[PDB]
Amino acid sequence: SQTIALLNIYRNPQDGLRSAVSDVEMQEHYDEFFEEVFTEMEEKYGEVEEMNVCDNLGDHLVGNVYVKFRREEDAEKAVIDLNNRWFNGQPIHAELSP
């Protein structure tokens, strides 16, 4: 497989005007996170074909990250190295995703 999955790596615990402000901050926090992960994927593991940060239950609280590397080789090596790294105070749980 060329795709790897970083399990529950995207965390995010805690009117009208409040909703709009909340939407913006979440979006900016999402984009910051994305760039953060994407850049590292390309910098140390290889060329990324596709990448997405998911919202598992739909509550924006937790999500997986999927990275499709152009090369099956890069993917397999990323999984091994990533499983030996920390991310935001938690160990990473990497896995090849069929």
Partner: peptide, 23 residues
């Protein structure tokens, strides 16, 4: 900001040794 930031107090063991204790 995120990369390689270990849980407080566990910088001296590896992520794999930390995960081994999770259940």
């Amino acid at each position: 900001k995120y990369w390689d930031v270990p849980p407080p107090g566990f910088e001296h063991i590896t992520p794999m040794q930390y995960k081994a204790m999770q259940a």
